[PDB]
Design a protein around this ligand. Sequence first.
Ligand SMILES: NC(=O)c1ccc[n+]([C@@H]2O[C@H](COP(=O)([O-])OP(=O)(O)OC[C@H]3O[C@@H](n4cnc5c(N)ncnc54)[C@H](OP(=O)(O)O)[C@@H]3O)[C@@H](O)[C@H]2O)c1
Ligand SMILES: NC(=O)c1ccc[n+]([C@@H]2O[C@H](COP(=O)([O-])OP(=O)(O)OC[C@H]3O[C@@H](n4cnc5c(N)ncnc54)[C@H](OP(=O)(O)O)[C@@H]3O)[C@@H](O)[C@H]2O)c1
Ligand SMILES: NC(=O)c1ccc[n+]([C@@H]2O[C@H](COP(=O)([O-])OP(=O)(O)OC[C@H]3O[C@@H](n4cnc5c(N)ncnc54)[C@H](OP(=O)(O)O)[C@@H]3O)[C@@H](O)[C@H]2O)c1
Ligand SMILES: NC(=O)c1ccc[n+]([C@@H]2O[C@H](COP(=O)([O-])OP(=O)(O)OC[C@H]3O[C@@H](n4cnc5c(N)ncnc54)[C@H](OP(=O)(O)O)[C@@H]3O)[C@@H](O)[C@H]2O)c1
Ligand SMILES: CC(=O)c1ccccc1
Ligand SMILES: CC(=O)c1ccccc1
Ligand SMILES: CC(=O)c1ccccc1
Ligand SMILES: CC(=O)c1ccccc1
Ligand SMILES: [Mg+2]
Ligand SMILES: [Mg+2]
Lengths: 251, 251, 251, 251
Amino acid sequence: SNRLDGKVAIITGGTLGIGLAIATKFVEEGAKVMITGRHSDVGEKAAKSVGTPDQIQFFQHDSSDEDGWTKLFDATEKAFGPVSTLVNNAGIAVNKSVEETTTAEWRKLLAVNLDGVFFGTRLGIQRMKNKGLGASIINMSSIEGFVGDPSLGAYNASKGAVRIMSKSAALDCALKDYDVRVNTVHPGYIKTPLVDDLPGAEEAMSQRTKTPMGHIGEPNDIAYICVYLASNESKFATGSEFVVDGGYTAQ
Amino acid sequence: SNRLDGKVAIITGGTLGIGLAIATKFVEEGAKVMITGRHSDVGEKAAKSVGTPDQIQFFQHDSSDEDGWTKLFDATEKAFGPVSTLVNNAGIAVNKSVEETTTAEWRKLLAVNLDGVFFGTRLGIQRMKNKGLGASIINMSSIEGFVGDPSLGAYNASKGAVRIMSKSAALDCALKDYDVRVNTVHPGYIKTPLVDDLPGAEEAMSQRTKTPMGHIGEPNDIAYICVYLASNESKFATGSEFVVDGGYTAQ
Amino acid sequence: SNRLDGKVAIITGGTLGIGLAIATKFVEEGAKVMITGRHSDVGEKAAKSVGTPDQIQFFQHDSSDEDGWTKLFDATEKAFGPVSTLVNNAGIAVNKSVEETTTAEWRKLLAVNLDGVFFGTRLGIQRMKNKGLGASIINMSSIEGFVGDPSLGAYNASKGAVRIMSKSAALDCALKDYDVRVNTVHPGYIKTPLVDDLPGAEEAMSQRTKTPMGHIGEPNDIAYICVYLASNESKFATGSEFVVDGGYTAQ
Amino acid sequence: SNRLDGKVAIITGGTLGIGLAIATKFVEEGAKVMITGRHSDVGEKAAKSVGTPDQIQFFQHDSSDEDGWTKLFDATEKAFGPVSTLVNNAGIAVNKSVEETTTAEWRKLLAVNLDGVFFGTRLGIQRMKNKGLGASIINMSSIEGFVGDPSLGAYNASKGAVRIMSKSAALDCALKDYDVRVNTVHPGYIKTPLVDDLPGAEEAMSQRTKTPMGHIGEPNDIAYICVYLASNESKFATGSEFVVDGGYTAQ
Ligand SMILES: NC(=O)c1ccc[n+]([C@@H]2O[C@H](COP(=O)([O-])OP(=O)(O)OC[C@H]3O[C@@H](n4cnc5c(N)ncnc54)[C@H](OP(=O)(O)O)[C@@H]3O)[C@@H](O)[C@H]2O)c1
Ligand SMILES: NC(=O)c1ccc[n+]([C@@H]2O[C@H](COP(=O)([O-])OP(=O)(O)OC[C@H]3O[C@@H](n4cnc5c(N)ncnc54)[C@H](OP(=O)(O)O)[C@@H]3O)[C@@H](O)[C@H]2O)c1
Ligand SMILES: NC(=O)c1ccc[n+]([C@@H]2O[C@H](COP(=O)([O-])OP(=O)(O)OC[C@H]3O[C@@H](n4cnc5c(N)ncnc54)[C@H](OP(=O)(O)O)[C@@H]3O)[C@@H](O)[C@H]2O)c1
Ligand SMILES: NC(=O)c1ccc[n+]([C@@H]2O[C@H](COP(=O)([O-])OP(=O)(O)OC[C@H]3O[C@@H](n4cnc5c(N)ncnc54)[C@H](OP(=O)(O)O)[C@@H]3O)[C@@H](O)[C@H]2O)c1
Ligand SMILES: CC(=O)c1ccccc1
Ligand SMILES: CC(=O)c1ccccc1
Ligand SMILES: CC(=O)c1ccccc1
Ligand SMILES: CC(=O)c1ccccc1
Ligand SMILES: [Mg+2]
Ligand SMILES: [Mg+2]
């Protein structure tokens, strides 16, 4: 209760799964939220499922769309006032090794997972700095930003990039007294409707050689660390990686 | 409010500084707390300053005292019921390089910072496992568990040890379905009365080449990440390192 | 002497600085080498300065040029036989924070430092696998793949990407018994003619708060770790990061 | 050939396995070597198997024996002249979780793996500094200094300690211009006669979920990285971790 009072958050890919849970908990803690997603059908439903338009709205946007980022920030401020909090959560995966990744696949994934995060972080710093907002940028950077996976080559590239680019941004903001923190969150495997739609995926993810807890997480596991990072409770945390993975990376 | 309802926590070195702030926020969130420290004068005052004996008590103990750990767990359970949460926060520092560390200094520091954490973690697992408590062991492992400092040789050894020993414990608990999580917290420099008593220390800690934010933290910065880790909000986090350092390790 | 007997290496950006030193030591250890660079004037001079055409040749290529990679591998094999070793060393830097990076700057840097490394790694795996060559791909991934720098935002992104993408590739090659290893090398600051051309740069790099050794490295420092990684001496090393930085990242 | 000309090395636990291979390659590269071990029977045989007494000798010593360290350095200097190189390789393992580790087991393992490395590093700095030797201390710090293992609790503690204590020492030596480098080497699983004596161990170590290469290493894999680190080739490497693990930590 009240942990995000006054905050105004953008959550990319906020209409499903992890992003939707982050949105839900943000609203519960007093934030106003603009969620984005590619599909209006899904997105309007999602916003209404969380709260009323005075609490949460949807904005249709592909995070790779540089011009759309400007429109997104403007729409959010029009609805809720100046943005304090950005969660760069939108992302896609290609299930290919580096060897077998086509250049089109490479470019498509990087456009969302790397360029999109860059566009959001860059614009967020510019729009959120020097306003006394306790501003916070939270970049979703995966266990695949720490360890490789033989069949996630491009995804690994994107997540390693987000991990270290976020430190750069954190440092510049800190050094310049911008009142903007930047941190990364690194989920392990999380149960969502999309995982449920892939037969055997959860079971394979839950083997002890993968996730030592013997089961996978759930979207609220990621929501709660994001509440901490968005809140003023984490005012001394910047440039750091927050891993919530069931032990995946500990072995 | 209510984030630690029902929890029963031991916080070593809980009478001062970081430990005291962790205790204060734990009580505010509904936990019952036993704080430890070496000095009864300080410790009884500290407990009363936070709350009444039904909320928080003091137990005099040096964390290097193996036999005392058993007495501490027994006293805490007698007061509050079964322990769910342990914060291994007690620690000391020697301001010597490896080269200049005497063997007595080495042994003294390791007894508190390494043996003490081992004793607490080992006993905590045994006493807290398999009780449906949502048990959590939080080990204080420092930015000096990630980077070296030329004048903190023994301290660095102890903090690196705690960092990786905690992963071992996390994994065993996960694999055995013990319902015990183990994580480490890594503060950067934090302002306390002890720092205030060392002329020039805060200023040197606050130079941008040390802490990019240009100032040091405060005890509640560490309290809030500990609330998260003690709570069931972090039920999928185990074997991980949580850094709150003002950017120190990001550069 | 003889540590790279029989090896055939491509070194991108091999006409200057670090790349040139890697080429020089590779030839001294018995490898045949194709160096690349953008400028024929510089590149032909460089090759001849190291050895004769039976030892080392130049191929003009921008590592962002996907089609040129195919031509480079074909030219190298025509000259020297099947390629065993690839050093993805070509890279550029933009001296901008994330906030101040233009999209053109972002795309330009990623094209060389990320796409180029992807193109080389992908093609290298395909061309070098399953030939009994003891093949090795060495990706230059910087101290800026571990820590952020407030004025190297895009560079940090690229180096973090290379760091983790290389692990993916390493794992797939290992799991598939391809006889290809992939590792990253992370130089700290190294003295080159280009550094000498920036007044004050070496001095600033040599301050103890930057490089604890109080001076910067020299190109052969990076050459020697690359000899190790190219050689069969390192046949059990894959997916790892090799840092040669004067202590930069240790504090 | 000649890569360690003039060097004088102490290798603890040099009579078997990894240590013996390091000794063998050191002698081949021109170093004079004193190997240590607990058992004279084994140690004298081992030294003679590598070379003549003008190249390599044995000194009986338990690395936990603080007073014996002084005698070891004196004996080595008497035989070969001033010591330039120390490899802290002696170590033991206890196959217990943190939960199940007895205090006696804890103390025994730490005495060898942590105190012994401290004693050697401390004395090495004192004896090797400021002599123009290109001195190098190489501390064996394991993949178990990066990741936990549920049944290696005390071992993990010791290896994490060595990892970060070595950075402290590296930094102090660098900052004080001591001409001493300190680095850590982190083997994955390596085939030795002792591994061969444990039925099924190699096979379990070689499963892809453990070592992605599908086989384990051999002692010379660790010898060759130690040659690099002992040599002047690595004069800009200090405070760093060198992992040779078949991909174990990359996933
Ligand atoms: N859940 C897991 O099993 C798991 C495990 C490891 C890492 N992760 C990472 O964690 C992040 C969040 O996961 P999730 O569960 O929310 O994802 P999800 O349930 O798998 O659904 C995919 C998400 O990606 C977003 N997205 C993809 N392309 C987009 C685009 N062009 N523009 C805007 N949004 C786009 C979608 O946003 P919209 O629905 O709003 O259109 C959607 O929410 C992901 O980026 C993923 O890489 C997830
Ligand atoms: N605050 C900082 O500037 C800073 C920076 C980096 C890391 N840290 C680490 O964070 C941890 C918490 O810091 P802090 O601010 O609470 O410490 P502090 O204000 O500096 O005071 C020292 C603390 O160490 C505890 N302690 C030392 N020996 C003990 C023993 N034998 N038995 C029980 N307790 C013992 C004391 O416990 P009692 O008072 O209860 O007797 C006391 O709370 C420390 O372990 C420290 O290593 C602190
Ligand atoms: N030296 C340092 O101070 C330092 C410090 C940290 C990291 N690094 C990294 O280490 C790597 C090697 O450094 P260095 O000293 O060799 O570089 P350098 O002396 O600074 O010269 C720049 C190099 O980048 C290469 N390059 C840039 N764009 C290229 C392109 N489009 N196609 C082919 N080559 C291109 C050039 O190759 P050609 O000359 O052949 O055209 C040239 O060798 C660099 O990638 C750099 O990011 C260097
Ligand atoms: N080989 C592996 O499967 C493996 C895997 C991961 C990590 N490691 C680590 O790598 C290091 C080297 O392995 P290794 O193969 O040489 O060991 P090993 O073949 O398993 O034999 C044990 C070694 O430990 C040394 N040792 C134990 N206690 C000692 C003491 N009190 N004083 C002096 N030496 C002592 C012995 O030295 P002496 O024989 O001279 O008496 C012996 O060489 C070890 O410390 C180990 O922790 C090994
Ligand atoms: C971990 C991850 O990003 C992923 C993506 C698609 C399918 C399975 C896993
Ligand atoms: C960082 C730390 O532990 C310390 C301890 C004593 C004095 C100054 C710093
Ligand atoms: C470290 C690095 O890449 C760099 C590049 C250009 C100028 C100064 C440093
Ligand atoms: C990895 C390691 O140290 C070990 C020790 C004893 C038995 C098996 C493994
Ligand atoms: Mg792993
Ligand atoms: Mg640093």
